[PDB]
Scaffold this active site. Sequence first.
Site, mmCIF file in Angstrom:
data_model
loop_
_atom_site.group_PDB
_atom_site.id
_atom_site.type_symbol
_atom_site.label_atom_id
_atom_site.label_comp_id
_atom_site.label_asym_id
_atom_site.label_seq_id
_atom_site.Cartn_x
_atom_site.Cartn_y
_atom_site.Cartn_z
ATOM 1 N N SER A 122 0.593 -1.090 -0.136
ATOM 2 C CA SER A 122 -0.117 -0.063 -0.038
ATOM 3 C C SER A 122 0.885 1.278 -0.024
ATOM 4 O O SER A 122 0.296 2.366 -0.146
ATOM 5 C CB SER A 122 -1.025 -0.104 1.207
ATOM 6 O OG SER A 122 -1.881 -0.933 1.152
ATOM 7 N N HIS A 143 -3.423 -5.897 -4.789
ATOM 8 C CA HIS A 143 -3.908 -5.164 -3.782
ATOM 9 C C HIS A 143 -5.033 -5.561 -3.074
ATOM 10 O O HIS A 143 -6.218 -5.598 -3.919
ATOM 11 C CB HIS A 143 -3.557 -3.809 -4.179
ATOM 12 C CG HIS A 143 -3.755 -2.935 -2.779
ATOM 13 N ND1 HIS A 143 -4.749 -2.134 -2.865
ATOM 14 C CD2 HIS A 143 -3.050 -2.909 -1.635
ATOM 15 C CE1 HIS A 143 -4.684 -1.208 -1.379
ATOM 16 N NE2 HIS A 143 -3.289 -1.727 -0.940
ATOM 17 N N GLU A 155 -7.183 -5.035 -6.599
ATOM 18 C CA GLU A 155 -6.640 -4.184 -7.275
ATOM 19 C C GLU A 155 -5.537 -4.728 -8.031
ATOM 20 O O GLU A 155 -4.643 -5.000 -7.223
ATOM 21 C CB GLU A 155 -6.481 -2.847 -6.657
ATOM 22 C CG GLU A 155 -7.885 -2.186 -6.156
ATOM 23 C CD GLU A 155 -7.556 -0.893 -5.467
ATOM 24 O OE1 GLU A 155 -6.956 -0.943 -4.400
ATOM 25 O OE2 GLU A 155 -8.326 0.077 -5.672
ATOM 26 N N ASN A 194 -8.188 4.179 -2.776
ATOM 27 C CA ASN A 194 -7.531 5.167 -1.709
ATOM 28 C C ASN A 194 -7.397 6.393 -2.486
ATOM 29 O O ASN A 194 -7.547 7.426 -2.060
ATOM 30 C CB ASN A 194 -6.006 4.821 -1.443
ATOM 31 C CG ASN A 194 -6.334 3.458 -0.535
ATOM 32 O OD1 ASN A 194 -7.199 3.129 0.229
ATOM 33 N ND2 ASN A 194 -4.956 2.518 -0.578
#
Lengths: 283, 283
Positions: A122, A143, A155, A194
């Site tokens: 991340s 992810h 992801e 995000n």
Amino acid sequence: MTGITNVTVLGTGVLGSQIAFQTAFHGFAVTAYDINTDALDAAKKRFEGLAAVYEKEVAGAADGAAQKALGGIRYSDDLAQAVKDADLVIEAVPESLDLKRDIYTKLGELAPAKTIFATNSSTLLPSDLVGYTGRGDKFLALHFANHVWVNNTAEVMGTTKTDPEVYQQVVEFASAIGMVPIELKKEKAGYVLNSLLVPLLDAAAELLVDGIADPETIDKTWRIGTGAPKGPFEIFDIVGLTTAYNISSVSGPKQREFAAYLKENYIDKGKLGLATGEGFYRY
Amino acid sequence: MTGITNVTVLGTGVLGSQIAFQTAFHGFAVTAYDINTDALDAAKKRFEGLAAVYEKEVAGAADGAAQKALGGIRYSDDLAQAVKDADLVIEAVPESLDLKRDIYTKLGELAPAKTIFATNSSTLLPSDLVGYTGRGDKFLALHFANHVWVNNTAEVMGTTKTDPEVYQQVVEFASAIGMVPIELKKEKAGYVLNSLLVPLLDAAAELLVDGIADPETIDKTWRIGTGAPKGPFEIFDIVGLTTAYNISSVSGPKQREFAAYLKENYIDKGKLGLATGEGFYRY
């Protein structure tokens, strides 16, 4: 005669154990790797808890299916042995360049040529790490989100060097383990989720920190205005305020002002959000 | 022996007519003001349509209640007469400094001393306009959202000069006309909702424009990741792409790049969103 079958997960923390368990639960042959038998003992404990959660929360896991998955997981603290016949290695070690650096240099040496490498990072871009792999055509990011059984996005994000065929195999792997593949076409820090969420939360925090509106008002505005079920501050509680504080305090000036606000008003009072039973809201 | 009873709304466009109708529907004595009899004729038409929408969409409006409200609205193209006994004037004229400037200078002269002034402005701050009113203690913003009967927030925002008692009366007025008062404590451009929403939409647009992900992928990520019922691009369709284009093209460089993207790929093809039946999505 098939694609991915043997999956090794590097790291058995909160994220690594969920990834490993989800993957095991869906029929793959999983090896969980970590540094010593103490870490492997803790991993078994995380897996036991996950089995319990699954049997109550996840379709098909009742009546022993979760335990069958649990009992089938192989534990290893020998990297070479852990990845000897791996089709895919999902790396979920701590968020450290040095630490991922040495892992990938070894991994690139120890893993058979067939092995796809996927990072769950991340904070680091696959471009930050690709050079160490020694197999740029077989390296990308996969992810996950905390609580993978419920927040089931994966992801997928490679580099310019990533082999499209590899990318598609990871996409198909993602689906096979019950995730919704979120396909990115180019690198982007923060992937998609995000990238969307941080700007919303930064905006709410600025309104709070600059004294424009209280949390309740900001949240009801979002819920009413967009139909979303939870507003920014309800979301902050879910993220965890210790987490939101850490992220904010290495960010911009308005963000660092929010960090100080959280620290004084919440963190210092043991009001950390959902975890402690009280954050911006009382639960 | 009571607070607000007579309400004059300045402007009878999309926003002014909804504000006027909502206010009339809830029992207040409403005067709708506009510049000539042609504009007043068009206002009556907007009101007739609103009556129809209400009778189908709004609790309590069936069986003639909507028409009673309709028939009770007074129309005026004489500002002095329009505001002679006004308790509150809601200003919803075009988004022009010159135009709001001359309105407020006159209004401040023509309205009895008791009159509260509220601007619905989405582009101008009450601080930009307060000087012209001649009554800073009685001037604030009362900001509605398109389709006020359903998106029923009323963002209340005054200046440092605003009388707290006036502010609370407007808050109580907001509730009395069926709105959820969103109470801001200090000025903020974009109030609360736009302050939260624009950063989310700017983030999605950047992901699209930089080739990171397609709209469907960005939207499903948001829906799954936050539980929101619609993602950014579904939201863009609702906003209207002509509107999103106008806003973006006077914004930052990434935003202006999105404007060009919309222009080429949507606006130029008559794909304007919900209105035309197709935008990012086909309806």
